[PDB]
């Protein structure tokens, strides 16, 4: 009963948006449908995180902080994964009932943010990331953004990261079968993790903007609670993105 096999079992099932393309296609409807889907996905992510060996050893405040700080990264990474598997990174596969065409991206209100999200999936395509590699990296993303003032249970947190860095090693081996150039693979995946801060930064920016200036878009309570809590901290520059390479 390995750690990686447990990560396979606790991985949330792909959710359906219930998007109704019989209705008129508007910007407000799409972003509200995506927000509602996102709220539900975040709920699943909380359940997922609680089932990660080690996560519950952390102080409850640390648990909240990590989820509040990384939720967007987890969602965008998963979206990148789905899009890679479902269409080889050619389409944004938010849900099996909400798949965005190349032609549907050519709309002014969503071209820019779609291009940002496609870049993530194209990294999966470029690196031919395996399922176990993806799962290990996703854990590490949950553990990649912290407060500058630090954490309440730092030592536990440091041991968790250590545990899942090793698991990522196993995922690399399980895929390649013990090469002498596995260090290059590890380097490439840590570089991808690092670049997730930048690739997601512009997504959070547009999200925060939409939430504050209500440019009328609906946010479910799950997202509203995290965003409004997360908002003042980013503006204060109080968040520390952890990076493997300086």
């Amino acid at each position: 009963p390995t750690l990686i096999s447990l990560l396979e079992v606790i991985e949330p099932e792909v959710l359906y948006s219930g998007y109704d393309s019989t209705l008129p296609d508007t910007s407000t409807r799409l972003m509200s449908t995506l927000n509602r889907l996102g709220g539900r996905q975040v709920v699943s992510a909380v359940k997922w995180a609680k089932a990660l060996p080690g996560f519950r050893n952390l102080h409850l405040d640390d648990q909240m902080t990590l989820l509040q700080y990384s939720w967007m990264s987890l969602m965008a990474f998963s979206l990148g994964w789905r899009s890679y598997k479902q269409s080889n990174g050619n389409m944004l596969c938010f849900a099996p009932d909400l798949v965005i065409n190349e032609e549907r991206m050519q709309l002014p209100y969503m071209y820019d943010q779609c291009q940002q999200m496609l870049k993530i999936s194209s990294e999966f395509v470029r690196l031919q990331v395996s399922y176990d590699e993806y799962l290990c990296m996703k854990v590490l993303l949950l553990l990649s953004t912290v407060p500058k003032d630090g954490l309440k249970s730092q030592a536990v947190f440091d041991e968790i990261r250590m545990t899942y860095i090793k698991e990522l090693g196993k995922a690399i081996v399980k895929r390649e079968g013990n090469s002498s150039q596995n260090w290059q693979r590890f380097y490439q995946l840590t570089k991808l993790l690092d670049s997730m801060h930048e690739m997601v930064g512009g997504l959070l920016q547009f999200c925060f903007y939409t939430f504050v200036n209500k440019s009328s878009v609906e946010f479910p309570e799950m997202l509203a609670e995290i965003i409004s809590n997360q908002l003042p901290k980013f503006k204060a520059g109080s968040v520390k993105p952890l990076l493997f390479h300086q």
């Binding site: 709920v43 359940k47 995290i226």
Partner: peptide
């Protein structure tokens, strides 16, 4: 806040 606190404690 309250909703995240709930989800972490539940089950």
């Amino acid at each position: 806040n309250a909703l995240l606190r709930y989800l972490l404690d539940k089950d």
